[PDB]
Amino acid sequence: RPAFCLEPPYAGPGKARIIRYFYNAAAGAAQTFVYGGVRAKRNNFASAADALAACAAA
Known part of the structure; x- marks a missing residue:
């Protein structure tokens, strides 16, 4: 999986x-967090499905 x-x-x-x-x-597992809207790092997705697709593929 990618390092991010x-x-x-x-x-x-x-x-x-x-x-x-x-x-x-x-x-x-995917988990929810509160993003402040600025300076997002790469491990940051709109949905658990998107986070899983990137990181637990496939």
């Missing part, structure tokens, strides 16, 4: 309140 799938989720310094998904490699 091993990244912790990054809320960043933004004040937005957006539900995003990251691949939690420790858990072997």
